[PDB]
A paper describes a structure:
A system for growing high-quality crystals of native Southampton norovirus 3CLpro (SV3CP) has been established, allowing the ligand-free crystal structure to be determined to 1.3 Å in a tetrameric state. The structure of native SV3CP has been determined for the first time at the near-atomic resolution of 1.3 Å resolution revealing a crystallographic tetramer. Interestingly, the β-hairpin formed by β9 and β10, which is involved in binding the N-terminal side of the substrate peptide, adopts an appreciably different conformation from that observed in an earlier inhibitor-complexed structure. It is now clear that the backbone of this β-hairpin moves by over 7 Å to open up the active site cleft for substrate binding and movements of some of the side chain atoms exceed of 12 Å. Indeed, in the native enzyme, residues Met107 to Gln110 occupy very approximately the same positions as the P5 - P3 residues of the bound substrate analogue and the sidechain of Arg112 occupies the position of the P2 sidechain. In addition to the movement of β9 and β10, the β-hairpin formed by strands β11 and β12 also moves to some extent. These effects open up the active site, suggesting that a fairly marked conformational change occurs upon binding of substrate. In the native SV3CP structure, no electron density is visible for the last 8 residues (ASEGETTL) at the C-terminal end of the protein. Mass spectrometric analysis of the purified protein yielded a molecular mass of 19,290 Da confirming that the protease was indeed fully intact at the time of crystallisation.
Author numbering:
A (entry chain A), C (entry chain A): 1 to 172
B (entry chain B), D (entry chain B): 4 to 123, 131 to 172
The structure:
Amino acid sequence: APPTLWSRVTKFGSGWGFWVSPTVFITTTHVIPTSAKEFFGEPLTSIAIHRAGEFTLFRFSKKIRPDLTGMILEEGCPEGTVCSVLIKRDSGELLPLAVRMGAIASMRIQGRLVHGQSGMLLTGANAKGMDLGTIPGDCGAPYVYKRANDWVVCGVHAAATKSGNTVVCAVQ
Amino acid sequence: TLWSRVTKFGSGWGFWVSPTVFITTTHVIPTSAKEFFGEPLTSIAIHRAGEFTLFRFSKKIRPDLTGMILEEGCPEGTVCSVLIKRDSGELLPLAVRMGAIASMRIQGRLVHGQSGMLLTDLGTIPGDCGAPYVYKRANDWVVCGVHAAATKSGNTVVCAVQ
Amino acid sequence: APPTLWSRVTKFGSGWGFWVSPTVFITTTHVIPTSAKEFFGEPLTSIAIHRAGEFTLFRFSKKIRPDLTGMILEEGCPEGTVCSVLIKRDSGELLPLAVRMGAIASMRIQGRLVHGQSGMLLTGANAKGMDLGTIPGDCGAPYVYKRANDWVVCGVHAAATKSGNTVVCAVQ
Amino acid sequence: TLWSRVTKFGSGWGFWVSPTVFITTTHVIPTSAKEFFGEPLTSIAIHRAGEFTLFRFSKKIRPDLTGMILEEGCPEGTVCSVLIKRDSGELLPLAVRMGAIASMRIQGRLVHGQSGMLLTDLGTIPGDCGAPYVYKRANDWVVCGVHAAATKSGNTVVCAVQ
């Protein structure tokens, strides 16, 4: 994935979020600290917060990231799309995990009911654990893909099954 | 052969697990009937669980067959074959990589079962409901559910399970 | 596959062959009986026989199959093409086995050295034996695919590994 | 991690199987050298078999590692991961379904090893030679060869084997 996409992936709460534009940041709802009253030096009163289940969007009054251009955010993607999940791991390593996307689904995964777009990893038969699959610390990582000359962001990492083969992207 | 067990039934198909046990997709079963396979309903134990239905006959309908293993779905990552018959005489064993159990929105409608993706004519069509999902485990064939639903595109399918 | 393709698949020697046109029949070399001096009621002297290893083409002086139109025969297909192998089995059943095609290869398969286009079956993990894979009696069955509005024939079945997962198409 | 074993070497990469054993693709190895990893060649046992090369050091170069299982290819149908590193810091574990051992014509040239097809950025590039092919078997990781060649398209790859 391009360096400009990796620059938008930001360590946040118990996981990650992603800058869509200078004023719009998206994440997975459960990584946000429940007591938090201040984000990027701005009080809640100066932020419009739009929560749809495990999808959260923050729209700031001030340009927080003026180095960035606005890109396209869509509500999931067509069945069969191959996305990359933009995962940062311990030591400047960058893991763009390949995932074939499927239908919108409701599942029970460990102690949680989750709803979003399902997908199947294309990294191995080999996805139980950190080397070729996801870990709980990856929540909030963006799902991206290239369409003609444009990159699209279409959701944030919300959950993975015990085997690691199935993942769920929370969508706007 | 496995293929001899795949039988035309209602608006689709079903599968003989043994001489006495037949499995199908619930929505393909006729809603007006007094017998199946020549046996009165009173001689049949019918077990419905959402889109999965099992029939257990009092007499041997298919005595030519041996019993095989029936399980509730299969591990994620298993590559199943869906044993699709067409009225042309074509046999289409389609490869599907299986995923999680889930409630899925498949052309507007909520279907509960095991998700799968095709590895690929080369896809399912509506008249294919009830076809069995099978795989080879060591020396033994396993049947693990019945074809319930597919999206417009044909990447995503749903195996209804016991 | 269309009924017109199945009509061209013909029981022949120890396997199968395929009518490309009214005058051209293709097969796998090893299914032809070694003593044979007559084919479709025509003597050898009235047939042009072109053998390239496990690929054999017969061009007849008379129209043997005037019910048929000539179709396109090519020398294998691009890597990544999904072909159907047109296999007839015991009882009017028709098995168009799906195969993802790969590189031209030289292999040792059981007691034979074989050369042709390799492919991997898409019927299962499940291809050891007759139900979802090939058997020795399938040799000579055609490899076909659709390109825009045309069907193409691109070789004949020559061999399969012990697991059943890899097959070899003999090519012109 | 498995990834810490993947090391830049020559015109590509190699892999530490244990503190003393390093595997790579033969064509990536320098042809002008008096040492590797600080050890004189006289202190190194070099075993070449076509496009597969194994180095066995007299001293522990990577004492932080445990030995893992090295095998001569893998069964057909195994889904391997190729552990590709890029100089950007990207880690690209690519899924490949493995096929037969064969001599294959790969961009004009004959390469002997185990064929594979990608299940899919999303493919290999020339600087990737020497990356290991791995898979999980029960509880144990297995390495079964090194990346030797790929076609222009990226469907077909060749794993060089011991």
